[PDB]
Symmetry: C4
Subunit: 454 residues, 4 copies
Amino acid sequence: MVRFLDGHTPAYDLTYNDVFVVPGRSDVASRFDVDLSTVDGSGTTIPVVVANMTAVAGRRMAETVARRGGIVVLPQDLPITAVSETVDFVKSRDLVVDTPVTLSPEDSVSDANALLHKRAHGAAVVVFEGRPIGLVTEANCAGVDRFARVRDIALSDFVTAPVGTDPREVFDLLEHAPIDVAVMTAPDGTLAGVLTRTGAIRAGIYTPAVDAKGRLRIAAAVGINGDVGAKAQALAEAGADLLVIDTAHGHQAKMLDAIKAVASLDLGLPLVAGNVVSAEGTRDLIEAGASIVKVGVGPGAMCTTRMMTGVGRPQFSAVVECAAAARQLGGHVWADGGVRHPRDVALALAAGASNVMIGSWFAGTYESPGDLLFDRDDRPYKESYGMDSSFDRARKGLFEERMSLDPARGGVEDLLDHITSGVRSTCTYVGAANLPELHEKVVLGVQSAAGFAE
Amino acid sequence: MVRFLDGHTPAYDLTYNDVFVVPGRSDVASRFDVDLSTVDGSGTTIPVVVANMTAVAGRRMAETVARRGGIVVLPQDLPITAVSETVDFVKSRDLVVDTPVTLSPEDSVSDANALLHKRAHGAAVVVFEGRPIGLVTEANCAGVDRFARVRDIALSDFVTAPVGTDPREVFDLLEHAPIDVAVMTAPDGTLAGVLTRTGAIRAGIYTPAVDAKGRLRIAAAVGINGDVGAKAQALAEAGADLLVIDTAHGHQAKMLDAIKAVASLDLGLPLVAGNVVSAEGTRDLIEAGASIVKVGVGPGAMCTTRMMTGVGRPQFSAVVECAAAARQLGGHVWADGGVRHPRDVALALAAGASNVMIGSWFAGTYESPGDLLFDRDDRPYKESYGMDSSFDRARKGLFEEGISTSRMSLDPARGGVEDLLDHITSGVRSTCTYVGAANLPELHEKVVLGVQSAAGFA
Amino acid sequence: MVRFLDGHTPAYDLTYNDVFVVPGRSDVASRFDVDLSTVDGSGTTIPVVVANMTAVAGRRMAETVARRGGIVVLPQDLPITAVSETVDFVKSRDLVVDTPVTLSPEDSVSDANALLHKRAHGAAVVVFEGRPIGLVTEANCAGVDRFARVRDIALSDFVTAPVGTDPREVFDLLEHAPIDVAVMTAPDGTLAGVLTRTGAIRAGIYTPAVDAKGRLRIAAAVGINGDVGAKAQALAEAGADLLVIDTAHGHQAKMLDAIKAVASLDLGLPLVAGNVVSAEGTRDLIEAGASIVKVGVGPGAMCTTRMMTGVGRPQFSAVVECAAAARQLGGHVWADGGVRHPRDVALALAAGASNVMIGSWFAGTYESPGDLLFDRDDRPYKESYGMDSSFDRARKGLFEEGISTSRMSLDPARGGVEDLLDHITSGVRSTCTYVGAANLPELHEKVVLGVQSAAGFA
Amino acid sequence: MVRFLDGHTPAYDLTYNDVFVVPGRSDVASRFDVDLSTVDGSGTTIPVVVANMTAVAGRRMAETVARRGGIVVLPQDLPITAVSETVDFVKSRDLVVDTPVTLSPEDSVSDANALLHKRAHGAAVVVFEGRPIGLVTEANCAGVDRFARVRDIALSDFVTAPVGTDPREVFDLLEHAPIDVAVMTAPDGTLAGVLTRTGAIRAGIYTPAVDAKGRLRIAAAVGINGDVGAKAQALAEAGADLLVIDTAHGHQAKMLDAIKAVASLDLGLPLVAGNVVSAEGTRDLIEAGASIVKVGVGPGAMCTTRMMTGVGRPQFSAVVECAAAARQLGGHVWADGGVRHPRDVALALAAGASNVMIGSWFAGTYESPGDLLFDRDDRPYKESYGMDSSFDRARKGLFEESTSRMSLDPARGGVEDLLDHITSGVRSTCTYVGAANLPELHEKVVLGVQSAAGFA
C-alpha cells in the first residue's frame, strides 16, 4: 500500500498534478546506488517500455532501447514477415556497440543527406565490401550537389578500435577527436558498428535487456480482431520475448475471450492485457490469464477520449487501485497514461506500477520511424503515416475519428537519461534503493489547484 | 439513480468539468450495437433536440435533423401562417432522399452562388418544367459574371436513379463520379430530390423520426405572454408533434398558469416546460401538466446570466436532481444547459436526461437560417437577425440587455449539421460501450461516475 | 440567515466566484415590481453607495447619482469651504431635471470642446443673461479654430418646454428631434436645466434620494488622524446627510477612539466606520458607537494588499459573517469589496449587506472628476490627480507604496454613470425575481445559495 | 500552535496561495513601532537572510544587507583565501556610511562606465592618494571616448560633511544638490565613504547587524562532501559569525554525520542544517546538533525539482509542521522556499519561521556579483557565472541538469529598495494582526483557507 499524509483523504480521484512525494529518511548515497530493474518478468533494467504506436516503434527504436535496458513493443497487425525480420535484426546486434548508418560510394548525396538524421551519431560510415573507408557529416553534404556520388566528399580520417575494447579506454581515445564517433572493427577488420563518448558511458551505467540466449529483448502486439490464437502463435515463434493484447476498452467480452485464446497456447511468455482503469477490470483480465495489466483510459480531462465520451479516470488513482488489485492475484501493472515528464514516470512507479509505457513523447527522436523535416523557422520535427468491403469502410469510417524535436538532445538515449535521472532522484528522496522499495517506503500528500496559479 | 465511486461526496455542486465516467464490464461489441432511441414520448431515434432559437431552427434545419432522428422546435412568436407553411413543408419531404437547391435558367449567377451554401450537397439542381436539366458547382460560378443567366454555365452531365432505389447500389453508382450528388427521379421523371455517397450511408444508420402518418416530426414553442391556450391550440392544429413552453425563469406563477392552460385543452401532445434547476421546480411543473421538464439556468460560471445576477446552477447536479424527481412522477427531463462537445451530450444522458437540447452549436452549419459570409481571413461564418408598443418599448428596453444579432464560425471540413450529428452520436455510442449499456435507459442504470479536481485542467 | 444547499459546507472561505444563487418559486411578475430601497438609514432608493475616492466623487457625481437614488461620499481631508460649496451646489439642483454644461458666447472652442465630455448629455447650453440662446455639439467643434468665440458656431434650433412639464409629453416632443436634449425653462424664462429622452425615463424608474427638506442626499468622509470630533461637526453643519469614518485597518484602538469622539457629539446622523472583515471587529466598532460597518480587506487573492501583507478575507464570507454580527447589535453592513459586475452587488446584498460601495468602477464615466483623454487608438479614458518636516515626509514616503494617479477605460456605448446604474440595478432586480423577493429584505431572507468548484472556470 | 478559522480543515497541504491572514484587534499605531528583530541567534534586526547562491552573494551584498539589518551567507566551496578577504573586508566597514565605487584618474572610461552600475549611488568617487578630487556620473561618460582618461571629464563640484555628522543634517545639505551623493570625510580629509538622501533615512530606520566586537555580521556555507570538520573550523577561524550546512536532500545519513562533525567541534556559533519538509527530519537534524532548521523542497508544483522527480511539499504547510517540531526542541526554522513577494516573507513568519531566506530575487540588483547588461530593448539585467576527475566529469554530468540571469527593476534597482518593499509589507502584516514584533506575530495570528476560484 501507499502512505498518504494524515488527514489527506480526498472526495475525488487523483491525477499526477494532484499529488507530491514527501522525502523521508534516506541511507542512499548517490543515484548510482539505485537498481531500476523490474520484477514483472519483462526483463527490463529500467522501468521504461515503448508503446506499440507505429510512429514510435521501428527497427531502430527497438534496438537502441533494449541496449539501454528498456524494451519496445511492435505494432499489432504488422506483417508477420516484417516482424520476424526485425526480431532477428535486433536480437543479432551488439550489446555495447551501436549500429551506424552505412553508405556505399555509389549512393547519391540526397540519399546520404537524408540518411544522416536517421541516427543520433551525427556521422555516416561509408562501406566498401564490408569495410569502412571513411565518414560523412552534414558539413560534408553542405555545398556538394545533390546528385554527386559520396566518393567525392568522403572524409577518410577517423578513429578505430577493435570490437570488445574496454569502453573506459575508448572514451579517452575519442577525447581530442574532431568527430565524436569511433568506428568499431571486427577481428578481420570488417565493420562491427560504432561508439561515441557518451554512448560509451552508457555501457558503464545502463544494463542491457537480454533473453535466455543473451540476445536483446523485444516484444510485439496483437488486436482482439480475427484469429487471436493464430497471431500470438506466429509472433511467439518469430522470437518475441513478450506479448501484448491491446484495445481501447480493455474490459469487454471480446478481450476476455482473446486472453483465454492466447493463455491456452501456453507459450510460456509474459502476457499483457489491454486497457482498464478499475480493480474489477484488473481482476477480470488477470483471471482470463493475463500476467500483466496495462492501465489508462482518458487520463487527461481535456484529451480527445474524454471530450468525446466523457469516459476516463485520473491516472494516479487508476494506477494505485489497479496495481493493488494485481498484487493480490500475484501480478503486475503497466502505466499507459501518456507521459511527457520524468515525474510522470516516478509517480507511476510510486503508485505501484512495475513498468511505465511511453507514447508519442519518443516520436520526437532520430530513432523513430518517421522522416526528419524542418518548418519555416527551420526547427526539426519528425513525421510518419498511420496507414475490407468498400461500402463498409465508409460506413465504419463515418463514426471514426508529427511531434517537435529537441535540437539540443534529439536522441531517445537522451530522453532516457532525463527520465532515469529523475526516477533515480525520487528514490534517493524517499530512501529507497530500488523500485520495490520505492512502492513500500513512499509517502504522498495531496495539494490543491491553487499552487498552479499565476 | 446514478452511482458515484465510494468516497466521492463533494461540498459543491458538479459541472460537466467536475466528473468522469468509469468503464465497467461490457458485452457490447461495437457502437453499431447501441440503441439511441428515447422513451420520453418525443419519438426521436437519437438523443438530440434542436433548440427554439431563431438563428438555429428553420425549415431546412427541421427537415435535415428529423431525417436522421432528431427533432427541431420552431421559435415562439413565429407567425402562425409561417409555421403552418414550414410544418406542411417538412412533413411532405422524403425520408431517405434530401432536398437539393432548385434553379431556373432565368435566375442569375449571383443568386445561384448564394444559394449553393444553403445545403451541404455542394451542388445545385437546375430544373426545367419540373425536370432536372443539369447541375451547378461553385467551380461553374467562379469566373462567370454575376448577371449572366445560369443557362450558360450549366453542366448537363450528372448521375440519375429512380426514387426507391436501394441505397447500397446508389453508393456504388456514385463511386467514380466527379460529383458526389446523385439526382433521384420520380416515376414520371420529375425531381424527387438528391442523395450523396455519405448521405446514402446515413439512411443506413440513422432512423428517421416520423409521426403516426409516417411524416417527419417537428415541434414548436410558445411564450407565457398573451394567450397561451390560443397559441398552443393554433400550433397544435397546425400540425406540431410536440409543444414547448419556454421562459427564462421556469419556476413562477405565470409559467404554472401557462402550463395548466395548455394542459386543460388536452391536445394529447407531449408538453415541455420552461427552465428549472431544482427538484421543487421540476415537481411543480409536472403537476401543472408538463410531461417533460427542461433544465438549465445560468449553467456557466462566467456566462452572461451568472455574471449579471449571480444566479444559476452547475448543470450535471441540476440534471441529476431534476431527472430523479421526474422519474418519481413518471416523466422526463431535457437538458438545456448549453452543449459545445459530445461529452456534454453523453454526461447529460448519463445523469438521467431523456433528451438533450442543442444550442447555438448548430448555428455554424449550412442548414441554419442565416446567410454564409466570409471574414478578413476568408473563414466561413453564418449570420442571422433577431428582429412593441408606443415608445413604452424604450422604458422596457432600458433594463433589457439589448443584444444585437450574432454570428457563429463554420467548420470548413465538415460544415453540415449531419456531420456534427456523426460527431455527437459517435461519442455517445462509445460512452454506452464503455459503460456496457446497449441503450439509453441502460446507460442511466449502469453508469458509474467519479469526481476530479480542478488541478487536472492545469 | 443565508441558506446553503444541503451538504455544501466548505473547509474554506468563499469569494463571489465560489457561490451561485439557486432560483426558488417566484410570484414576482417583472423587475419593476422590486423595491430596491434600503433600510439602513442611508436613504438610498437603490443599494448603491459611491466611494469616497478622489477620482470618483465630485460635484457632478453627487448630483447625478442622488437623482437616481444613490448617495456619494465626499473625500476625507477635503477643504471644508470646498465641501460646503459642493453640498450647497448639489442640494440646490432639480430632482427631475439635470444640469447641462453652460457656455458664454465669449468662451473659446477649446474650452467648449473640453467641457462637453464632462456630462453625458452630448450637448452644451449657450447662455445669455441667464437665458438659452442655443446648443453646441461635438460636430460643431470639428472644423472651427480652437480660439474662435463660440458665438460663431452656435446652432439656435432646439426644443423647449416649461419646467415642471410632464416627462411623457417631453419624450413625444423630442421623438423626431435631431438633438436628444430638451431645454427646461423657469417661469421667468431663465434656464432651470435640461432633460433627455432616456434621462426622462429614469425619473419614471429611479426614485431620488432626498433629506427632510426634500434636498438630494450627500455624504462625507473623515480620516482617523487629528481631531475627529471637530472635523465631523464641521461636516454635519455643512449639510452632510451621513458620515463615514474610514481607514485601512478598521479594527484598532485608534479607530475605536475616533468613533467614540463622533458618537459623543450626538449629531443625529448615520455613522459609518472603516474596514474590517471579522465578527469581533464588527462588534467593537458598533459598540464604540458606529451605526453601519463597512467591510472588506484584501478581497482579491492577487490584489496589492494581499500580495504585500498576505492579509485579507474572501468577500462573500466576510459580508455574511459581519452582517450577522451587525444585525444582532441592531445595525447594518456596507460591502466595500471592489465590484466590477452586477452580480457582485447582488451577491453582496444576498449575503446580508444593506448597501454596496462602488469604487473606481465609476471613475470610467463622463460624470467623474477627471478630464477625458484619448489614447493612441482613440479610445476614451478618464484621468485625475491624487495631489510634515521633509525629513519625516521622506521618512514616511520610504515605506509608502508611492503610487501615482491612475486612469480608467470608458465604455464607448454607455459612458454615463447613469448607464452603469441601469446595468447594475437590472442585474440586482433579476436576482430578486429569480429568488422570489419583492425587495432587499426579502432577498436576504428567501435566497438559497450553493458552492461551485474551480473546475467550472476551465 | 497556529489558529485557523473554524471549519478550515483541508484534506490537502497548503501553499502560500492557499491561505490568508485575518486581521485581529490592534493597539499598534504605525509600522515604525514594530520590532523585526529575530531571537534565533542570527543577530538580524530584520527577518531576512540572503541565500548562499553564487549569483546573489558577493562582497558588496554582505556589506549592504548587514548594514540594514540582514545577513548574507557565503557560498560553499568558495576559496578559503577569498572568504577571509571578504570577511575581513565586510567586518571592517562603516555602520552608517556606505562604500562608493572608487576611481583613479588613470582608469579608462570603459572601466568607469562599467564600474558605475556595481553600486546604487549613481556616482563614482575619483580618488587621489586617498583623497576625494571629484565625482563621475553616467552623464559624464556619455560623449567621452571609451579610452580617454577620466581626468578630463571629472566634475569637482560635490557636497561634503565630516564623518560622524548627524544624517538629518546631511540630508538638508544634499537638498538642492544636483548630485544625490554626499562625500563623507575622515578627520584627516581622506575618503570615509558616501551617503545619499534616502540612505540617510535608512540609518534612522534600519538597525545594523553586528557581532560582539561591533563588526558587521556575515555567514558562510559548507557542503557535506569532503572533510566537513576541516572546512567548518577554518571558516569559523576566518571570522564567520554563523554557519550553514546545505544540501538538496537534508534528511539522509550523510547529512547527519556532517552535522555531528561540526557540532563536536563546539565552535559556539549558530548552526543551520540543510533542507527538509517533515517534522521527523526537523528533529533528526536538531538531534544531530543543528541549532536551526532550513526548510523547503520542491515548493512549487511546476518547479524543476517537482517536474523531474515528483518530490516536494507545499511550503506553508511544510514550515508550520517543521517550526512546531523545532519550537518543542528549543530550536528554530528558516523558510527556504524561494520568495518573489513581501507576502511570502510575512506568511512564512506567520507560519512560525524565525527567519526567511531570499533567493535569486536579489540577483536582479546592483549589488549582486554579476555584470549589468542591457537587452535589445535596452532593459537592465544582471548576469553571473556558476563556474577534479577527468572521467567522472562525463559520468556524473550525464544525470546532471548553465548560469542564469535576472531582470532588474528600473525604478528600484538596489537591494535596499527591495528591503524597503519587503519590510513595508511585513510591518503592515504585524499592524494587521496587532503584533508589535515577530514573536507576537506567530502568537497572535489567525489564518484561513481559500479555494482556487478566487484566482479566476
